[PDB]
Design an enzyme around this catalytic site. Structure first.
Site, mmCIF file in Angstrom:
data_model
loop_
_atom_site.group_PDB
_atom_site.id
_atom_site.type_symbol
_atom_site.label_atom_id
_atom_site.label_comp_id
_atom_site.label_asym_id
_atom_site.label_seq_id
_atom_site.Cartn_x
_atom_site.Cartn_y
_atom_site.Cartn_z
ATOM 1 N N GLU A 11 39.344 30.701 40.364
ATOM 2 C CA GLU A 11 38.399 30.913 39.921
ATOM 3 C C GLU A 11 37.998 29.406 39.235
ATOM 4 O OE1 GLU A 11 36.008 33.144 39.508
ATOM 5 O OE2 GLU A 11 37.371 34.695 40.720
ATOM 6 N N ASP A 20 27.031 30.090 34.191
ATOM 7 C CA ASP A 20 27.252 30.403 35.531
ATOM 8 C C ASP A 20 26.024 30.275 36.504
ATOM 9 O OD1 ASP A 20 25.730 33.155 35.153
ATOM 10 O OD2 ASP A 20 27.736 33.976 34.505
ATOM 11 N N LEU A 32 32.596 35.460 29.777
ATOM 12 C CA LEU A 32 31.303 35.589 29.371
ATOM 13 C C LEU A 32 30.830 35.647 28.187
ATOM 14 C CD1 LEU A 32 28.083 37.230 31.085
ATOM 15 C CD2 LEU A 32 28.774 37.653 28.682
ATOM 16 N N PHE A 104 38.642 41.534 39.755
ATOM 17 C CA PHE A 104 38.105 40.200 39.183
ATOM 18 C C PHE A 104 37.185 39.607 39.975
ATOM 19 C CE2 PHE A 104 39.183 37.427 35.454
ATOM 20 C CZ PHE A 104 39.941 38.211 34.671
ATOM 21 N N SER A 117 42.699 50.794 53.203
ATOM 22 C CA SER A 117 43.745 49.877 52.676
ATOM 23 C C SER A 117 44.317 50.101 51.484
ATOM 24 C CB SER A 117 42.640 48.601 52.324
ATOM 25 O OG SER A 117 43.209 47.416 52.063
#
EC number: 3.2.1.17
Length: 162
Positions: A11, A20, A32, A104, A117
């Protein structure tokens, strides 16, 4: 490694109040602050959040903590999820970390869509699963991270990020 380090790398980590893509004040590894066009506001939430006279900039350790609080917040959510909960428990320490890194980046709802998956993950079919992801929109999208995270599911080791 550790989950913190693995996000630092994916990130990135900001130690001074920044906006952002959405232009919401953020700080640390995607923490945030607030979504009100006020600097003062965010500056307050901040100080409040960490506790002191930070004034727009925090320590590397100060950010880790927030980051932790968000992992916490994000996993809490994973357990409270019907589709996610089961696989998450079948996971081992490190591939717990890959999932967080996946939520995330593309939240719960998104991770949840990875049906076949998740089944294979659960079924501990580490290679068919690695495979099965390297065919999805996602790897198109974020080819690098995509890989790194997929190795994490393959191995179950910090190779891809060390």
């Amino acid at each position: 490694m550790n989950i913190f380090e693995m996000l630092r790398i994916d990130e990135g980590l900001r130690l001074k109040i920044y906006k952002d893509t959405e232009g919401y004040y953020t700080i640390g590894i995607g923490h945030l602050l607030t979504k009100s066009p006020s600097l003062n506001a965010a500056k307050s939430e901040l100080d409040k959040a960490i506790g002191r006279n930070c004034n727009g900039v925090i320590t590397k350790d100060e950010a880790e903590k927030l980051f932790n609080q968000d992992v916490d917040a994000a996993v809490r959510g994973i357990l409270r999820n019907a589709k996610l909960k089961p696989v998450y428990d079948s996971l081992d320490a490190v591939r717990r970390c890959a999932l967080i890194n996946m939520v995330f980046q593309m939240g719960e709802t998104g991770v949840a869509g990875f049906t076949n998956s998740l089944r294979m993950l659960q079924q501990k079919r580490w290679d068919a699963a690695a495979a099965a992801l390297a065919a999805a929109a996602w790897a198109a999208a974020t080819p690098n991270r995509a890989k790194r995270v997929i190795t994490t599911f393959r191995t179950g080791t910090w190779d891809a990020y060390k």
